[PDB]
């Protein structure tokens, strides 16, 4: 029947998007991990750190990158448009706090960047001198590229994709104003769970599919107007 | 028509794979370009280079990584199983020759790795000190991963995908023995060109589709048993 293949197809497409997001995240993390390990060869050498973070390919790979020191709360960073003032303590920032807590590569919750004032996420990493925790790094990620990427399938031209945290905070949405808000704001009475829920919103039936990204326990969400999907599939029929 | 939508979905599937291969290459190149740029901070410091190439994330991201020097023909490399004998000249090797000729990041033709003696390809990069060319690097890539990745769509269970150079040399094939051989050895009677060719091999009709990867001018190739693909679509009816 129409329904079985509509969900079969929706299934394959979401899984494809899931793999795309996982690969892109793996790419960013790999670059963050190696930069961090390379800096660990001499992490207190601020001149070394500065040259690395200003190297063009790496600089072009993130919104901004920086290194905060446990010992004096100073910061080495490559943001041309920002210089931390006296009150800025990197040790209170979420990328640093998370990286210190987990003692490994972390991806933060969405938060307000003090530099661009935009909602972003950062990859955070701990920095060690042998077994001494010396500080932490941020590698900031602009969320609109994620929203483009997560929309690399077409869902029978019957809907769109977005990304949420494991607690329902939007990570990427075609409409960036949603980033950092509960997804319930744009998608009322839907539970956050793996699989497919059929919903009614203002007189129409939609399909909401969630697939988790095991690396960060993000969910890929897809919303599909059931009628359009059935009609588009059926009119190949 | 059955054929119209078979061609349509086949097109969509190859598109997704092309983007998957591009992202993967992009990721490998980005890590290779950044490592190279970081080494250029002190390219003749072989202890620095050695420490970088041995750092665990980078080390685990490639088959092997090394840096060959123009002046003394020495090699710094992270391959546990291989140490350059007296006959070895990095300057005669394809990754080196190519990086030198183009003066930017390159991806070699398939060739026989001196270390593992397997067909591989390498990312090659040139190394500068100030303005002079100091040497080059290799970042070796195992081709069996690429074969897996290129086969991330199912083609209505009617065939398989592979990768060829712009001159028809196989880069990745489900059967590793084909790597580095012209593709006509497993796929005779077919021209290498963008688009779809319809051929007959041993009393049977197949669809051969090629999509080029603009980064490296590789082609993604897909071979499809049109009777299976037609019948599979007919089943969806
Ligand atoms: Ca700055
Ligand atoms: Ca060795």
In chain B, where does DSSP find H-type helix?
Answer: 2-39, 46-53, 56-59, 94-102, 143-150, 226-236
CB-based contact A21:A146 (threshold 8 Å)? yes
> How many angstroms separate the CA atoms of B115 and B180, rounded?
17
CB-based contact A199:A189 (threshold 8 Å)? yes
Nearest-CA distance from B125 to chain A in Å? 13
CB neighbour list of residue A195: distance below 8 Å, 6 or more residues apart? A209, A210
Interface contact A16-B16, CB threshold 8 A: yes
The separation between the first and the last C-alpha atoms of chain B, rounded to the nearest angstrom, is 12
Residue B177: exposed, middle, or buried by beta-carbon count in 10 A (0-12, 13-18, 19+)?
A: exposed
- Ligand 2 centre and the CA of B124: distance in Å? 18
Residue A228: exposed, middle, or buried by beta-carbon count in 10 A (0-12, 13-18, 19+)?
A: middle
Query: Residue A187: enclosing H or E segment and its boundaries?
Result: none
Hey, is A163 helix, strand or coil? strand
- Ligand 1 centre and the CA of A91: distance in Å? 18
Interface contact B55-A38, CB threshold 8 A: yes
A23: closest CA among B13, B27, B56, B152? B27
Position of tokens 């839907």? A190
Position of tokens 């054929």? B3
Work out whether the CA dihedral B154, B160, B165, B166 comes out positive or negative. Answer: negative
Position of tokens 């097109």? B11
User: What are the structure tokens assigned to A31, written together?
Assistant: 């670059």
Which one of A2, A15, A55 makes the best mutation probe of the B interface by having the most chain B beta carbons within 10 Å?
A: A55
Ligand nearest to the CA of A84: 1
Nearest-CA distance from A229 to chain B in Å? 15
Hey, is B21 helix, strand or coil? helix
Residue B7: exposed, middle, or buried by beta-carbon count in 10 A (0-12, 13-18, 19+)?
A: middle
Work out whether the CA dihedral B40, B42, B46, B50 comes out positive or negative. Answer: negative
Residue of B nearest to A3 (CA): B236
- Ligand 1 centre and the CA of A89: distance in Å? 15
Experimental determination technique: X-ray
CB-based contact A192:A210 (threshold 8 Å)? yes
Interface contact B30-A55, CB threshold 8 A: no
Work out whether the CA dihedral A191, A192, A194, A200 comes out positive or negative. Answer: positive
Backbone dihedral region of A46: left (phi > 0), alpha (psi from -120 to 50 degrees) or beta? Answer: alpha
In A40-119, where does DSSP find H-type helix?
Answer: 46-54, 56-59, 94-102
Query: Residue A15: enclosing H or E segment and its boundaries?
Result: helix A2-39
Residue of A nearest to B59 (CA): A34
- Give me the half-sphere count of Cα atoms (radius 13 Å) on the Cβ side of residue A154: 9
Cβ–Cβ contact A51 with B under 8 A = yes
User: What are the structure tokens assigned to B232, written together?
Assistant: 């599979």
CB neighbour list of residue B1: distance below 8 Å, 6 or more residues apart? none
List b or e across B200-231, with b for residues whose CB sees 16 or more CB atoms inside 10 angstroms.
Answer: eeeeeebbbbbbbbeebebbbbbbbbbebbbe
Which residues share a beta bridge with B68?
Answer: B75, B136
> How many angstroms separate the CA atoms of A136 and A75, rounded?
10
Position of tokens 């593992």? B116
Which residues share a beta bridge with B138?
Answer: B66, B124
Provide the angle, in degrees to the nearest 10, between the axes of the packed helices A2-39 and A46-54. Answer: 140
A219: closest CA among A169, A152, A145, A157? A169
Of the partner residues A16, A33, A52, the one whose CB lies closest to the CB of residue B57: A33
Hey, is A234 helix, strand or coil? helix
Hey, is B48 helix, strand or coil? helix
CB-based contact B156:B209 (threshold 8 Å)? no
* Angle, CA of B88, B121 and B29, to the nearest 5°: 110
Nearest-CA distance from B54 to chain A in Å? 10
- CATH architecture for the domain at A31-142: 2-Layer Sandwich (3.30)
Provide the angle, in degrees to the nearest 10, between the axes of the packed helices B2-39 and B46-53. Answer: 140
* Angle, CA of A210, A216 and A220, to the nearest 5°: 20
B122: closest CA among B96, B161, B103? B96
Residue A85: exposed, middle, or buried by beta-carbon count in 10 A (0-12, 13-18, 19+)?
A: exposed
Interface contact B34-A35, CB threshold 8 A: yes
CB neighbour list of residue B221: distance below 8 Å, 6 or more residues apart? B161, B162, B163, B164, B183, B187, B208, B209, B210
> How many angstroms separate the CA atoms of B95 and B75, rounded?
13
CB-based contact A10:A222 (threshold 8 Å)? yes
User: What are the structure tokens assigned to A93, written together?
Assistant: 């920032």
Rg (CA), chain A: 21
> How many angstroms separate the CA atoms of A226 and A77, rounded?
48
DSSP string, B98-149: HHHHHTS-EEPPPEE-TTT-SEEEEEEEEEEETTEEEEEEEEEE-HHHHHHH
Of the partner residues B26, B37, B55, the one whose CB lies closest to the CB of residue A34: B55
What backbone torsions phi and psi does residue A105 show, to the nearest 5 degrees? -60, 130
Q: How far is Cα of residue B180 from the mean position of the Cα atoms in its chain? A: 11
Tell me whether strands A195-201 and A204-213 are parallel, antiparallel or unpaired: antiparallel
Q: How far is Cα of residue B3 from the mean position of the Cα atoms in its chain? A: 32
Cβ–Cβ contact A47 with B under 8 A = no
Of the partner residues B23, B35, B237, the one whose CB lies closest to the CB of residue A24: B23
> How many angstroms separate the CA atoms of A118 and B203, rounded?
62
Work out whether the CA dihedral A199, A201, A206, A209 comes out positive or negative. Answer: negative
* Angle, CA of B66, B67 and B72, to the nearest 5°: 135
A24: closest CA among B107, B147, B26? B26
> How many angstroms separate the CA atoms of A191 and A211, rounded?
13
The separation between the first and the last C-alpha atoms of chain A, rounded to the nearest angstrom, is 11
Cβ–Cβ contact B34 with A under 8 A = yes
Interface contact B38-A55, CB threshold 8 A: yes
Hey, is A227 helix, strand or coil? helix
Contacts of B20 in chain A (CB under 8 A): 19-20, 23
Cβ–Cβ contact B47 with A under 8 A = no
Nominal resolution in Å? 2.1
Position of tokens 């001159």? B167
Nearest-CA distance from A25 to chain B in Å? 10
DSSP A159: E
> How many angstroms separate the CA atoms of A191 and A208, rounded?
10
> How many angstroms separate the CA atoms of B145 and A29, rounded?
19
CB-based contact B61:B31 (threshold 8 Å)? yes
DSSP A104: S
Nearest-CA distance from A29 to chain B in Å? 10
Which residues share a beta bridge with B206?
Answer: B199, B225
Q: With respect to CATH, is domain A1-30+143-237 assigned 3.30.450.20? A: yes
User: What are the structure tokens assigned to B162, written together?
Assistant: 């592979």
Hey, is B155 helix, strand or coil? helix
Nearest-CA distance from A143 to chain B in Å? 18
DSSP A108: P
- Ligand 2 centre and the CA of B68: distance in Å? 13
Please give all residues whose CB falls under 5 A of ion ligand 1, grouped by chain where several chains appear: A 79, 83
**CATH 3.30.450.20 location in chain A:** 1-30+143-237, 31-142
Distances (CA, A) of B53 to A49, B11, B56, B104: 18, 40, 8, 20
């Amino acid at each position: 029947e129409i329904e079985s293949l509509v969900q079969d197809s929706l299934m394959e497409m979401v899984k494809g998007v899931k793999n795309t997001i996982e690969s892109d995240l793996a790419s960013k993390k790999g670059l963050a991990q190696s930069t961090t390990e390379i800096l660990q060869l001499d992490p207190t050498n601020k001149a070394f750190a500065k040259s690395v973070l200003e190297s063009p390919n790496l600089k072009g790979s993130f919104l901004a990158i920086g290194l905060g020191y446990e010992s004096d709360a100073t910061v080495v960073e490559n943001d041309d448009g920002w210089e931390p003032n006296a009150d800025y303590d990197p040790r209170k920032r979420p990328w640093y706090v998370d990286a210190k807590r987990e003692r490994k590569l972390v991806v933060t919750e969405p938060y307000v960047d003090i530099s661009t004032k935009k909602i972003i996420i950062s990859i955070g990493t701990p920095v060690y001198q042998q077994s001494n925790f010396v500080g932490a790094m941020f590698y900031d990620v602009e969320l609109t590229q994620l929203a483009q990427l997560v929309n690399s399938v077409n869902l029978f031209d019957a809907g769109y994709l977005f990304i949420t945290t494991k607690d329902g905070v939007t990570i990427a949405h075609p409409n960036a104003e949603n980033n950092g808000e509960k997804f319930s704001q744009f998608l009322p009475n839907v539970d956050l769970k793996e699989g497919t829920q059929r919903i009614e919103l203002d007189g129409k039936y939609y399909l909401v599919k969630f697939a988790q990204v095991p690396s960060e326990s993000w969910y890929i969400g897809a919303v599909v107007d059931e009628s359009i999907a059935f009609a588009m599939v059926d009119d190949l029929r």
